[PDB]
Amino acid sequence: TAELKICRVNRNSGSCLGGDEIFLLCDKVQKEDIEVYFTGPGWEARGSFSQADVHRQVAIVFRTPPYADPSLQAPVRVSMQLRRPSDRELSEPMEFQYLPD
Amino acid sequence: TAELKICRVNRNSGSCLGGDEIFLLCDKVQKEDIEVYFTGPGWEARGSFSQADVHRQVAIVFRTPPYADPSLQAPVRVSMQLRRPSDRELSEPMEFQYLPD
Return the residue in B11, B20, B21, B25 with the most chain A beta carbons within 10 A, the one to mutate for interface testing: B25
Backbone angles phi, psi at B31, to 5 degrees: -55, -35
Rounded to the nearest angstrom, the minimum Cα separation between B58 and chain A is 7
Q: Say which of B8, B25, B61 has its CB closest to residue A8.
A: B61
Number of domains in chain A: 1
- β-strand partners of B78: B96
CA dihedral sign, ordered A96, A39, A7, B4: negative
Resolution in Å, one decimal, please: 2.0
Is B25 in contact with A59 (Cβ distance < 8 A)? yes
- Under DSSP, the state recorded for A90 is E
Contact (Cβ atoms closer than 8 angstroms) between residue A44 and residue A37: yes
- Under DSSP, the state recorded for B2 is T
Separation between Cα atoms, residue A46 and residue A30, nearest integer Å:
16
In 3D, which of B56, B47, B50, B57 has the Cα closest to residue A7?
B56
Q: Which amino acid is at A80?
A: M
Give one DSSP letter per residue of A24-65, joined into a string.
EEES---GGG-EEEEEETTEEEE-B--GGGB-TTSEEEEEPP
A50: Cβ–Cβ under 8 A, 6 or more apart, which residues? none
Separation between Cα atoms, residue B44 and residue B61, nearest integer Å:
19
Contact (Cβ atoms closer than 8 angstroms) between residue A29 and residue A58: yes
Residue A98 is part of a domain; what is its CATH number? Answer: 2.60.40.10
Say how many C-beta atoms besides its own lie within 10 A of residue A53's C-beta: 17
DSSP count for chain A of H helices, then E strands: 0, 9
Which range marks the domain in which residue A11 is found? 1-101
Q: Could you give the strand order of the β-sheet that contains B59-63, starting from the edge strand earlier in sequence?
A: B6-9, B21-26, B59-63
Is B10 in contact with A21 (Cβ distance < 8 A)? yes
Q: Which amino acid is at A71?
A: S
Contact (Cβ atoms closer than 8 angstroms) between residue A60 and residue A54: yes
Q: Say which of A10, A23, A58 has its CB closest to residue B56.
A: A58
Separation between Cα atoms, residue A4 and residue A80, nearest integer Å:
12
Give one DSSP letter per residue of B40-73, joined into a string.
ETTEEEE-B--GGGB-TTSEEEEEPPPPS-TT-S
Half-sphere exposure of A56 (CA within 13 A, CB side): 19
Contact (Cβ atoms closer than 8 angstroms) between residue A46 and residue A60: no
Method: X-ray
